[PDB]
């Protein structure tokens, strides 16, 4: 159960020059490529070890597709201005995301392709990979253009074969790290309040980001009074999370913390 996803953004700056194009690529929870139009020598750069040895031919082609799409977005932003009768003095944003989804067997499960203008849905490829869904009457202009251009056929061709093949290749060249889970490093800290107390479950250094933290008391899933923070990146490819609870002093040893994660053979249980 793996995936490959791309995220592209174009932002126009009237008077400051031409739009700013950035694009990144992911395999599961691992960034592996990047492109920034504002760089001194704009080119695609590896950000994972397993695409570092693909050869100059491979990387030159990626660079030339990024530059072509940054140019394509430059026109799209101008088209969207006219559709919506917008003036030329404002900054507007264009976003795009697409990718694969594989199952356990390694064959396709579902594909993605959608766009957004100024933070709202614009057009999206349907799950059938042959029809479109337009968000408003402006997007219906773009729809019948792509219908007249046989474009949905070309997008289905990428997701159904090209996108499936290369995620498989990436998954094998980097199975040492992409298919090897990193268990979390857990520990509990006590933090006093006043004559009650707080118990914190920590979890650091794990990958992927899917994890579950639950506090308990005498075996009963106690959740109402459980503080919980958003999963955050550590900065080296791993993630963090913690769960807190408040407890009458002296009762601290009755509370256990349970962790479920892919890298663990069986769920964990911790005590202060």
């Amino acid at each position: 159960s793996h995936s490959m996803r791309y995220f592209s953004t174009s932002v126009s700056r009237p008077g400051r020059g031409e739009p700013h194009f950035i694009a990144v690529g992911y395999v599961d929870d691992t960034q592996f490529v990047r492109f920034d139009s504002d760089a001194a020598s704009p080119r695609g750069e590896p950000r994972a070890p397993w695409v570092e040895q693909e050869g100059p031919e491979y990387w030159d082609r990626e660079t030339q597709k990024y530059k072509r799409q940054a140019q394509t977005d430059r026109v799209s932003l101008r088209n969207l201005r006219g559709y919506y009768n917008q003036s030329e003095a404002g900054s507007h944003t264009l976003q795009w995301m697409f990718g694969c989804d594989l199952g356990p067997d390694g064959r396709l499960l579902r594909g993605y392709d959608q766009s957004a203008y100024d933070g709202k849905d614009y057009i999206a490829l349907n799950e059938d990979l042959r029809s479109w869904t337009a968000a408003d009457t402006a997007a219906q202009i773009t729809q019948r253009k792509w219908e007249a251009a046989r474009e949905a056929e070309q997008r289905r061709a990428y997701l159904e074969g090209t996108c499936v093949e290369w995620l498989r290749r990436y998954l094998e060249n980097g199975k040492e790290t992409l298919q090897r889970a990193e268990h979390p490093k857990t520990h509990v800290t006590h933090h006093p309040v006043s004559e009650e107390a707080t118990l914190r479950c920590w979890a650091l250094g794990f990958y992927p980001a899917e994890i579950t933290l639950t506090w308990q008391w005498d075996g009963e899933d106690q959740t109402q009074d459980t503080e919980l923070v958003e999963t955050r990146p550590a900065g080296d490819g791993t993630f963090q999370k913690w769960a807190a609870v408040v407890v009458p002093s002296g009762e601290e040893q009755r509370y256990t913390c349970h962790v479920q994660h892919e890298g663990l053979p069986e769920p964990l249980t911790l005590r202060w």
Binding site: Y6, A23, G25, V33, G44, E62, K65, Y66, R68, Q69, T72, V75, S76, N79, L80, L94, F98, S115, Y122, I123, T142, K145, W146, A149, E151, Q154, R155, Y158, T162, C163, W166
Partner: peptide, 8 residues
Amino acid sequence: LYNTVATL
């Protein structure tokens, strides 16, 4: 692999 498509 990256893909590039038509304009809006």
